[PDB]
Every structure is written in C-alpha cells, then in structure tokens.
Enzyme design. Structure first.
Site: not given
Ligand SMILES: COc1cc(OC)c(/C=C2/C(=O)Nc3ccccc32)c(OC)c1
Length: 293
Positions: A17, A19, A36, A126
C-alpha cells in the site's frame, strides 16, 4: 539497471500500500536488501516520510533497518533489510489458519511492535497481517516478526510534549476494510486504540481463518466499507471469539472499549497471551506452525 550508487536491483518481491518492492543486493558486501521504488508526482507520501519513520523506529526491536533513500530519475528509492514471507502468506501456507499457540506467540511480538510505534507518538493506521514479516528464512531473526510499510503512520501526539492532538470524526477514509476498528468505520479519527482493535480482528482472522464480515454484495467499493462496518457492529464479541481462549475475548472486549485518549495497558494485553500459552503448557519458543513445511 542499478540504483543507490552501490545497490543493484533484482526481481520483484511484491508491492505494498504505496508502491512496488524489488529485492536488491548491496554491491559492496553481498548482502540481500529490499529496495522500494516510488514515482515523484501527485503522490509524495515519499518513501522519504517512510524513511524518516524507518529512522525513528530505528533501534526498536523487530523494526527493519533502513539503508538509503534518494532520487533516481522518475523515482524515489528506499533501501531496506530483506525479510521472510509475510504472516499472510504464512497463514495460507500453514493451511488457511494458525493454532492457538502460534497465534499467542505472534500476538505478543506483534502487539509489541504496535506499542513501540505508539511510544514514538505514532498511530500505525494500517494494521493487516500482510504487513508483518519474519526474519529471512535461515538467519538469527527468522523467528522474529517485524513491521513494514509506515506509509500511513501519523503523529497522534506531539512527540515532545506528548500532548495528544485533536479528535474529529469527518475525514477521508481510505484503508483496508476487513480489519479496521468500528471507530474507523464510523468516521472517528484513529488513536492508539484503533491499532490494538484491528490487531485483534487480525488475531481472530488467524484463528478463524476468516472474519464474519468478509465478502459483501449489493454494494460497490465506497460503500462496502459500510456493509462490513455494520456486520462488524452487528457481530457480538462472544460470537466472534466463540470457541477460543477467553483471553482473546478479554482482549477484544478491552480494545473495542478504550477512550479516544486511553493509554493501553500493554502489559495487561501481553499478559493475556502469556496465560494462553500457560494453559497450553507450552512456552514462548518459536514453534510457529511455519517451520515444518
Ligand atoms: C504492504 O506493503 C508493504 C509490505 C512490506 O512487507 C510485507 C514492505 C516491506 C518489505 C520489506 O521490508 N522486506 C520485504 C520483503 C518482501 C516483501 C516486502 C518487504 C513494504 O515496503 C516498505 C510495503
């Protein structure tokens, strides 16, 4: 290509939520990171403001370290530690639902994370299981659960005076249905209580495999938040927590009842899960259901 001067991008590991998130790798140590990306436009919840939050919480248990943030063309980048699968996939992978034990042990860490944040004068706003990750598969933290994505965190109190700010009941509304608190649904502003409440809708999601308000016809999208809220409202906590440790009920009943400024008795809530583990004769070892496959 390659950004963050020494960070090269890899495959896409998902989006959040906010990008997309690719899993890079620092080109100066061989350690897998999380990168990110975010465009520069109408949106500006900038990985920056998120970076700044990854900065604040930096040093608080179960919070991913931050590693970089800049401007690569049409984008904004934020480098972060890599982490294991999200509690949401885990659930799916563990068979549409967890076991009281596993839940109890997660609840603690989770609940711990939502406190740290609160102690930094920030509501998380969230709360969903998709936001909780476990340390990388085979490391020293695999058995830890972190929080990720602070794209919605807001200051509920002056981080200095700690003086709580206002309490309206009239703004926007753009979150994730299924778990928000009833207040949220009603328009009320969100305080530290809303965080603990949704956390319990999440603990019951784990146990039940689903909540009673999922899926709702007759509406569209800007209205579904209604039908869902209503059901949430027309759903008694006995019925919801029916057939599960009393602590859980005790938890939800507490949360769904705090005042807009009420400072949660985090110890009371943490104690409820510790008991849950006491009845089971188990302990807070990390025998999560997800380390067997
Ligand atoms: C809900 O959206 C989000 C969900 C997140 O982890 C599940 C993350 C951070 C993540 C992170 O810090 N490591 C990862 C490895 C795989 C997938 C997401 C991440 C993110 O970025 C900050 C946005």
């Amino acid at each position: 290509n390659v950004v963050g001067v020494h960070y090269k991008v890899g495959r896409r590991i998902g989006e959040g939520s906010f990008g997309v998130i690719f899993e890079g790798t620092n080109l100066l140590n061989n350690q897998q990171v999380a990168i990110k990306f975010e465009p520069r436009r109408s949106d500006a919840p900038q990985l920056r403001d998120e970076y700044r939050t990854y900065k604040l919480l930096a040093g608080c248990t179960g919070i991913p370290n931050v590693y970089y943030f800049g401007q690569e063309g049409l984008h904004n980048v934020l480098v972060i530690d890599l982490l294991g699968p999200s509690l949401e996939d885990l659930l799916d992978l563990c068979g549409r639902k967890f076991s009281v034990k596993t839940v109890a042990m997660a609840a603690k860490q989770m609940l711990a994370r939502v406190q740290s944040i609160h102690e930094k004068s920030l509501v998380y706003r969230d709360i969903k299981p998709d936001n909780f990750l476990i340390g990388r598969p085979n490391s020293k933290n695999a058995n830890m659960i972190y929080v990720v994505d602070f794209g919605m965190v807001k200051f509920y109190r002056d981080p200095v005076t700690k003086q709580h700010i206002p309490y309206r009941e009239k703004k926007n509304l753009s979150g994730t249905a299924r778990y928000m608190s009833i207040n949220t649904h009603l328009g009320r502003e969100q305080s530290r209580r809303d965080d603990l409440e949704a956390l319990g809708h999440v603990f019951m999601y784990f146990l039940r495999g689903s909540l009673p308000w999922q899926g709702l016809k007759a509406a569209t999208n800007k209205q579904k938040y209604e039908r869902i809220g209503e059901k949430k409202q027309s759903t008694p906590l006995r019925e919801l927590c029916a057939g599960f440790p009393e602590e859980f009920y005790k938890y939800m009943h507490y949360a769904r009842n705090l005042a807009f400024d009420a400072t949660p008795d985090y110890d009371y809530l943490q104690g409820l899960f510790s008991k849950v583990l006491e009845r089971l004769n188990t302990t807070e070892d990390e025998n999560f259901d997800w380390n067997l496959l």
